[PDB]
Design a protein around this nucleic acid. Structure first.
Ligand SMILES: *C[C@@](*)(O)[C@H](CCCNC(N)=[NH2+])NC(=O)[C@@H]1CCCN1C(=O)[C@H](N)Cc1ccccc1
Ligand SMILES: *[C@@H]1O[C@H](CO)[C@@H](O)[C@H](O)[C@H]1NC(C)=O
Ligand code: NA
Lengths: 27, 250
DNA sequence: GTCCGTGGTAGGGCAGGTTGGGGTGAC
């Protein structure tokens, strides 16, 4: 229900270093 | 992980370490899918060609962990297993078809900054995210080349088109598996390696800000070879099976 | 257009099971 939303990241509007690479590959 | 990197703290909080008690041994990775369920690869529990058939009392699970050596106090949790459930159609001889297993913990685990379950895909996650060139992220404490890292390693790898996966190996590929990795000229490198089985291949959906486990590290031929690709168990394919055993035996 | 259940990883059998769906479908 709360799955896949990381406390240290999504929850506190922070990105990890390389998640953008993943997004870009979806383009 | 080969050509990966040290993860950031809390970057993979559904990451789970699968242990042999005696002699102590880091066996495989795994993933936290709810407070009482862990996903992993069946070949980590059951592999008859090496007379490997573990019982719940042979193993121990470690969650919330970042560094492979240190006990991390008030960070990591240990769990025992109530029951193991291997897919009835798992094939250890030919091609590790359906290489998937579920583990029910004896007690549930409290979540924290460091312990948080990942989502499983439904039809739309599979429709939208399972595409050649799209990258996911794999994590593990297994081999750095074909020593062993101190800190969880992470790497991003693109899903490879299916004919290319088929052609690149003589093992009979299957609809319940996919492959991921860079083609020889694409510059970039990287792969999972032995000791990484069971770890998750996650993808962050651009539609909700959520991480989905699309794969389970399953097999390969060496690690990080040109024209070779890591193989992963197709999670969504096996979704109905996961839900049933959880529903029925949870 | 066609094809993905009768053993196989394996029993008892021709369903259905924790398991033969329907899809990144492949071909
Ligand atoms: C148990 C897992 O750690 C491991 C993962 C290896 C992943 N490798 C890459 N390059 N991404 N799996 C295995 O080691 C499996 C189980 C036993 C043998 N095996 C293999 O991958 C062999 N290398 C090849 C193989 C043999 C038999 C059937 C399928 C594949
Ligand atoms: C593995 O061990 C279990 C528990 O001992 C046993 O009941 C089962 O038949 C074994 N499976 C094998 C060897 O495939
Ligand atoms: Na490769």
């Amino acid at each position: 229900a709360d799955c896949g939303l990381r406390p240290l990241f999504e929850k506190k509007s922070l990105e990890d270093k390389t998640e953008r690479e993943l997004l870009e590959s979806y383009i | 992980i080969v050509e990966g990197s040290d993860a950031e703290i809390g970057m993979s909080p559904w990451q789970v370490m699968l242990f042999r008690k005696s002699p102590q041994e880091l066996l495989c990775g795994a993933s936290l899918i709810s407070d009482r369920w862990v996903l992993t690869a069946a070949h980590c529990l059951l592999y008859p060609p090496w007379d490997k058939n573990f019982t719940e009392n042979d193993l121990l699970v470690r969650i919330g962990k970042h560094s492979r050596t240190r006990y991390e106090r008030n960070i990591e949790k240990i769990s025992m297993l109530e029951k193991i459930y291997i897919h009835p159609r798992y094939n250890w001889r030919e091609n590790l078809d359906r290489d998937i297993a579920l583990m029910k913990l004896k007690k549930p685990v409290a979540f924290s900054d460091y312990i948080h379950p990942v989502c499983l895909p439904d039809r739309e996650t599979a429709a939208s995210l399972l595409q050649a060139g799209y990258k996911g992220r794999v994590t593990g404490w297994g081999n750095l080349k074909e020593g062993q890292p101190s800190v969880l390693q992470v790497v991003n790898l693109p899903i490879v088109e299916r004919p290319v996966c088929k052609d690149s190996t003589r093992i009979r590929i299957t609809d319940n598996m996919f492959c991921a990795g860079y083609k020889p000229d694409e510059g970039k490198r990287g792969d999972a390696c032995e000791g990484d089985s069971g770890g998750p291949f996650v993808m962050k959906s651009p539609f909700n800000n959520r991480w989905y486990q699309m794969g389970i590290v399953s097999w390969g031929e060496g690690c990080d070879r040109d024209g070779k690709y890591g193989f992963y168990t197709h999670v969504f394919r096996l979704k109905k099976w996961i839900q049933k055993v959880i529903d029925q035996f949870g």
